[model samples]
Target: GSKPFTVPILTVEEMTNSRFPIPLEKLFTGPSGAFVVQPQNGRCTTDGVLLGTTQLSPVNICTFRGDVTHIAGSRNYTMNLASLNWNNYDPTEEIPAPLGTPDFVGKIQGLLTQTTKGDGSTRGHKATVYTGSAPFTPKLGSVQFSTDTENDFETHQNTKFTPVGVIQDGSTTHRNEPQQWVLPSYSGRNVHNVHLAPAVAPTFPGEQLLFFRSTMPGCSGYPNMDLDCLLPQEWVQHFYQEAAPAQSDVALLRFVNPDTGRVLFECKLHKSGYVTVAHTGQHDLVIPPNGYFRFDSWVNQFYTLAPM
Candidate 1:
């Protein structure tokens, strides 16, 4: 016998700002168990969670040498890049490659899913990566400080400038090569000498990349989601001995392209650790646990990079 197509019914009209109970099938699959529903109506006010209340870990802090009269984009653009290997990807299950550093660079076509367009069609979004070995250098005497107050929030909350200690290498920059291998040269050259000539070593420069997204343009409310993997207050405490205050409000991470003199991305630290893709990239301090407490910091206060 064929199962009858039945639609579950609901009594609630779902007037406004409220959700009606959905069918169990609409919910995630799970073992049968007792369930209850509760609504939040508590009158008690929340006061412990403070924004921008970071413990001031050993990361560097840059005091503005000159007045930052203007800002180009949103205040938060920090991303963590990690390399992955397809060989490490499982057949039964997909998994991130063991990423300590990147060894190659290119677009991963099939790896990413395509989005449906408004025209009711889908297009493949291939990522493009640039590979080179140019001696990346910040502009001479430009300013190198860990304390980029731009990472500071615009709220009226009290600024905790009192350094608990020096923000050291923890606040520094990170780098890596691609994890996968590709042809040394995509050219038609056949001779080993002509192809592998030492003089052919054009400035193979590494670039710092950025990925940003948010409900608001320029990623207004970000890094605020509470997940251990991202903004993982637990691991940050272990690594830097700095515990994120309840609802740690601060720039969870930052990314800058020194070559373009651009602030790539900035993510606000949130009570719930929700990181953005812009904050995820192929660089140091990204993660053994993607977007986990591990993915934090930049290689330099700034870095030179090629745009993707």
Candidate 2:
């Protein structure tokens, strides 16, 4: 049942340190002035809506940054993958606006350890390190939440999850774009310009915030593609068996931003028919029930039907 719902995206007013632009919709505040949205279905199609405010439980929404010292006023942001469907022109379709605009990259994904400061003291929130399957790349690409009550937002610098690098140009690029084409630099630090700066540094002006990066193979073009990105037939089968739903009126493919909790991509998996490939030399396959495939650039091939 679709109820009237609205999630207000908020930003702090530069001059008003304690106030945000009043949203058209009502706002709910969480612990430590953290904003929240009421319980809703897993299908979130709104921009500027953070995962912390939604009911959708992220499989793994961890931070890869160090320096847990800034505990007093830290915050996180999120974007909906379904919201970033730029090609979906259907006005009636249940989709959200694309992340960013023609020149600016929108708030697509983000993560931060929730904390609370009270009476000259600070403590961690529910965010913890993930124990599931270790889905992060590099050594510390993702951070996990602690068990039921251990809310300590501190990780050793070496043990902290490492943020993925990106091309800091203000060009028009979305999370759906191929990573190699952008030639993302994962120097742990942000990369400012495509040429200047170390191989790794802030890629953009706002390097302080968290962002979602793809671990999937990009550019299925040119010669000598990396086959390692391809998933074993068994891996694909497991997706159908374990991850996908058994029966549903509508099944959709979703690409999630692990860092920001934004839904960077979403679409219906056609019952029968092959989806076009974005790159060259890639073959096509029929989209299965509630299924879709994603490419991994690091390994250079299509991985299983999307990653968690």
Q: Which candidate achieves the best lDDT against the true structure?
A: 2
lDDT of each: 0.20, 0.22
Model 2 lDDT per residue over 185-295, tens place: 211124221211111111122111111111321222222111111111222223333333223322233534445655544332221111111221222222222222232
Per-prediction TM-score to the true structure, in the order listed: 0.16, 0.20
lDDT of 2 at 244: 30
The backbone clash count of each candidate, in order, is 55, 31
Model 2 misplaced stretches (Cα beyond 4 Å): 1-58, 61-67, 71-108, 115-183, 189-308
Candidate 2: what lDDT? Answer: 0.22
Expressed as tens digits, the lDDT of each residue in 23-131 for candidate 1 is 1111011111122111110000011221121221212111101111113353221111111221222212211111111112211111111223344443221111121
Worst ten-residue run, lDDT, model 2? 12-21
